[PDB]
Ligand binder design. Structure first.
Ligand SMILES: COC1=C2C[C@H](C)C[C@H](OC)[C@H](O)[C@@H](C)/C=C(\C)[C@H](OC(N)=O)[C@@H](OC)/C=C\C=C(/C)C(=O)NC(=CC1=O)C2=O
Length: 214
């Protein structure tokens, strides 16, 4: 329908600024963070399902799926985890500074590896290493499908989703890659990052590859 617009908490805006404007070299850790987040979302729905089995019926398969969309310069990271409601997207992705935002920034300026970002509970924002824009598309059993969108600006939008494929249940991180980071559309490069930083993931990690038939 129509978008609602929200302002980022001052700390989160600062964090995004740091990250988006970094010379940092090890940018590939963004994928470890998103996969770990995906894995956590999958842990949640599975634990929930222990005493509420019906929760799984909206998407019985538990998986992490990565889909490069080279034409649009887009990389998607999807999971069939618990998903997030409209209120969760608003409350947890910007309007309330995470418990570790300022501390991570303090740590960063002291010499800390950007890769520590996950230990501070703000690793979602690492996607800004390789992307200048992001849509978080999410369907929780408890709500309708919604789109959360940010370009690292000081505000984000949340919109009821009438334009994307239905996700049964879970979350798509749709990354609009920067022009210098298009290597992450490549099958070989993706595979390599996964093997190096994400060896111990309990769920299948699927890669969607689009090849011309000869
Ligand atoms: C331990 O929980 C985690 C927290 C608290 C987080 C808001 C919990 C959230 O609400 C309670 C859901 O329960 C949880 C299932 C949803 C995800 C992990 C989403 O990931 C996917 N694929 O669904 C993630 O990204 C879309 C949303 C925000 C992540 C933040 C801002 C971050 O920077 N790091 C974090 C990583 C975490 O694991 C973090 O803060």
């Amino acid at each position: 329908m129509a978008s609602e617009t929200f302002e980022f908490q001052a700390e989160i805006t600062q964090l995004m600024s740091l990250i988006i404007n970094t010379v940092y070299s090890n940018k590939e850790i963004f994928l470890r963070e998103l996969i770990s987040n995906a894995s956590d979302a999958l842990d949640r729905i599975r634990y929930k399902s222990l005493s509420d089995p019906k929760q799984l019926e909206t998407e019985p398969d538990l998986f992490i799926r990565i889909t490069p969309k080279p034409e649009q310069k887009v990389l998607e990271i999807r999971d069939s985890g618990i998903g997030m409601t409209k209120a969760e997207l608003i409350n947890n992705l910007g309007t309330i500074a995470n418990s570790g935002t300022k501390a991570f920034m303090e740590a960063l300026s002291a010499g800390a590896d950007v890769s520590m970002i996950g230990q501070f509970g703000v690793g979602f924002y690492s996607l800004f290493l390789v992307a200048d824009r992001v849509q978080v598309i999410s369907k929780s059993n408890d709500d309708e499908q919604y789109i959360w969108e940010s370009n690292a600006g000081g505000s984000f939008t949340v919109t009821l989703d009438e334009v994307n494929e239905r996700i049964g249940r879970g979350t798509i991180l749709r990354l609009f890659l920067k022009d210098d980071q298009l290597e992450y559309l490549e099958e070989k490069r993706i595979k390599e990052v996964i093997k190096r930083h994400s060896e111990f993931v309990a769920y299948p990690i699927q890669l969607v590859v689009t090849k011309e038939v000869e």
